[PDB]
């Protein structure tokens, strides 16, 4: 019986460390990859938006 309790602590603490790591790392990987990716998407969209604004001004002159 008390071995059940020990097994529970063994899995919970192995899980705790796996989880402190997975909780943090899954977010740091997904989250930093996401902002890095979307920081670039945001910049590329802003660049394209500026280019289209310029393109629209050029057509207006045409």
């Amino acid at each position: 019986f008390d071995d059940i309790h020990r097994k529970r602590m063994e899995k919970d603490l192995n899980e705790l460390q796996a989880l402190i790591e997975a909780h943090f790392e899954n977010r740091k990987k997904e989250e930093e990859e996401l902002v890095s990716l979307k920081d670039r998407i945001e910049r590329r969209r802003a660049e394209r938006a500026e280019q289209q604004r310029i393109r629209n001004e050029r057509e207006k002159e045409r």
């Binding site: 705790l16 899954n26 989250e31 969209r45």
Partner: protein
């Protein structure tokens, strides 16, 4: 050719307009979408991170 050009030019404009309209709605999509993309997973991810710790009692 004049009519085909007007139609093609009109379509060049409409298709390019659709391209810049979609590039914009896509950017405006994706950009707002990445916000969701970056915060829905980070909020839920940090919620789950926190859960490992929230449940450490």
């Amino acid at each position: 050719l004049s009519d085909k050009l007007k139609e093609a030019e009109t379509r060049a404009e409409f298709a390019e307009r659709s391209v810049t309209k979609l590039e914009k709605s896509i950017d405006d999509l994706e950009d707002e979408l990445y916000a969701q993309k970056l915060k829905y997973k980070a909020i839920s991810e940090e919620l789950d991170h926190a859960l490992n710790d929230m449940t450490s009692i």
